[PDB]
Amino acid sequence: MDINGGGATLPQALYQTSGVLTAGFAQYIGVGSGNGKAAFLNNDYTKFQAGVTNKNVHWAGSDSKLSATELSTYASAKQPTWGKLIQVPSVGTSVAIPFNKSGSAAVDLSVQELCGVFSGRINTWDGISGSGRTGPIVVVYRSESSGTTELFTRFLNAKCNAETGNFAVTTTFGTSFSGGLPAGAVAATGSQGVMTALAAGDGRITYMSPDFAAPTLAGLDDATKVARVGKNVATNTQGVSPAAANVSAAIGAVPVPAAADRSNPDAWVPVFGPDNTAGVQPYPTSGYPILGFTNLIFSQCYADATQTTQVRDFFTKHYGASNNNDAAITANAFVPLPTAWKATVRASFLTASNALSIGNTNVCNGIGRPLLEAA
């Protein structure tokens, strides 16, 4: 009986790369982070494959953090019989700004121009300085509950302080800005659905997984297709591309989860946010500024011993010092976790005597998510 996972589309091509998921894992199903969280929290396989009810959900990918209400409801309804859930970073990622507007001139957005495009204040390509382009801008956004939206709106919430309204951190972009969507904005579903829409009319722009924002990695550096971010005309400063190399230093500087807080799944997922605000990492001053983590959601405990071993073997690979997934992570435009982060994940969720360890024979005694499905 295979282990079934799915959720976030931002990293789906990573999890679909041969060998990244280990023995016993079904191929990953990309449906969006909101759907992934709901699939795991409710053990609802229909959130992965509509109309299919004869399988359990074992894990999810999400770039949206579990909310207080999600965590509390799982703790009271499911944890007594299934064990604690585990929420852990998988990889670091940039958020790219692909667009469909031809021209040899590089498109390099200042942060305030980015803010104005996504608030609707700036609605013509003229209004992007130095763009070489004219005509209307059409914003494409995610229709559904999206972790890419959450990562992106964290940045807008932190930086966009000069609009007629404010951006809230959310998974649903259509309600993020208090002044509404830009006129003419187009909704689409999934990372790939957004990229298809980007191409379906001229002058379109969006926010996107770096693994989908260009067909090839080098394409993240083509500023005729993927905007640079960080222009400052007055100081004569160029913005840079969302290539993984331009976020990797900032990802590597993020502190490991605080030791005393490790039983709280919320403590494991770092978030970027406003400056001089404890509990959130400030966005980096150098390199590419829009970044965050995409995460995995598992159970500590599975009633079946084989499924338990299979899950542990995946963690051994994904968080291993050797024989790990880091090459595939880079190939998919993402940032590996550093040694100290991997070691911290292993110490809590693999090392057998830890109270948090997957399959712990004491903590998981008699408990765990079920082998058979029942309705």
Side-chain angles (χ1 to χ4, degrees):
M1 199 47 59
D2 284 353
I3 295 281
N4 303 307
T9 70
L10 170 150
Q12 72 184 31
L14 168 62
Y15 302 136
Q16 296 164 177
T17 293
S18 192
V20 166
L21 305 180
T22 50
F25 281 65
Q27 297 303 299
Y28 183 84
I29 299 167
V31 288
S33 293
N35 287 317
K37 292 193 297 172
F40 179 89
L41 294 166
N42 301 289
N43 191 33
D44 181 5
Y45 193 82
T46 72
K47 293 285 181 301
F48 292 169
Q49 297 187 339
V52 179
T53 53
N54 67 344
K55 292 183 174 176
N56 289 320
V57 173
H58 299 87
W59 70 277
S62 185
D63 5 82
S64 169
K65 286 194 56 165
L66 288 158
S67 69
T69 304
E70 285 168 318
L71 288 168
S72 66
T73 298
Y74 192 87
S76 61
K78 305 304 192 187
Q79 177 177 321
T81 56
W82 293 353
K84 285 174 62 56
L85 69 74
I86 294 169
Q87 184 182 225
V88 285
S90 179
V91 302
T93 188
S94 64
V95 177
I97 308 297
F99 61 90
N100 174 32
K101 187 69 174 181
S102 62
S104 61
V107 174
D108 185 356
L109 295 163
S110 69
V111 170
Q112 289 308 303
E113 284 167 344
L114 177 76
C115 293
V117 167
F118 286 89
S119 74
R121 173 176 54 87
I122 299 172
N123 63 21
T124 62
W125 289 90
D126 313 61
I128 297 168
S129 67
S131 71
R133 291 155 166 79
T134 65
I137 300 174
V138 167
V139 170
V140 184
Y141 70 96
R142 291 284 292 282
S143 69
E144 81 289 32
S145 178
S146 163
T148 308
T149 297
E150 186 172 296
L151 291 178
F152 182 53
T153 64
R154 288 184 186 292
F155 182 78
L156 301 178
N157 171 264
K159 297 294 183 166
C160 303
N161 67 331
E163 307 303 318
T164 62
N166 292 101
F167 293 96
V169 180
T170 183
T171 74
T172 56
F173 188 77
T175 55
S176 177
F177 189 59
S178 61
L181 285 165
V186 172
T189 309
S191 291
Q192 295 160 296
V194 163
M195 292 304 292
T196 292
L198 197 72
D202 198 13
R204 292 181 177 196
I205 189 161
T206 196
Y207 58 94
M208 184 55 54
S209 170
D211 210 12
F212 292 102
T216 69
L217 294 178
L220 296 176
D221 296 308
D222 182 351
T224 78
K225 297 180 172 289
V226 176
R228 298 163 184 169
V229 180
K231 182 172 68 196
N232 183 323
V233 179
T235 65
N236 202 44
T237 302
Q238 289 187 80
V240 305
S241 80
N246 303 326
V247 294
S248 61
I251 288 299
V254 173
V256 301
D261 300 327
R262 288 174 185 155
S263 71
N264 182 356
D266 190 67
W268 281 84
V269 178
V271 299
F272 292 85
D275 285 353
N276 292 297
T277 306
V280 307
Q281 290 308 313
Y283 287 99
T285 55
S286 61
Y288 185 81
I290 323 179
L291 82 181
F293 292 90
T294 186
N295 315 308
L296 295 166
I297 301 164
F298 278 79
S299 186
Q300 187 181 350
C301 306
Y302 294 85
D304 187 60
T306 301
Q307 293 189 334
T308 296
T309 299
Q310 290 164 332
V311 168
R312 291 180 55 79
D313 291 346
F314 171 63
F315 275 68
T316 293
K317 185 166 198 186
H318 202 61
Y319 302 99
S322 293
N323 296 298
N324 64 35
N325 289 324
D326 290 356
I329 290 167
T330 72
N332 281 275
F334 301 129
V335 182
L337 303 181
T339 294
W341 261 94
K342 293 192 180 73
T344 301
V345 173
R346 298 195 306 275
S348 285
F349 302 116
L350 287 170
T351 300
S353 60
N354 200 283
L356 301 184
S357 67
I358 295 157
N360 178 306
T361 61
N362 293 305
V363 174
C364 297
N365 191 318
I367 66 168
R369 293 185 67 116
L371 176 57
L372 304 175
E373 180 284 328

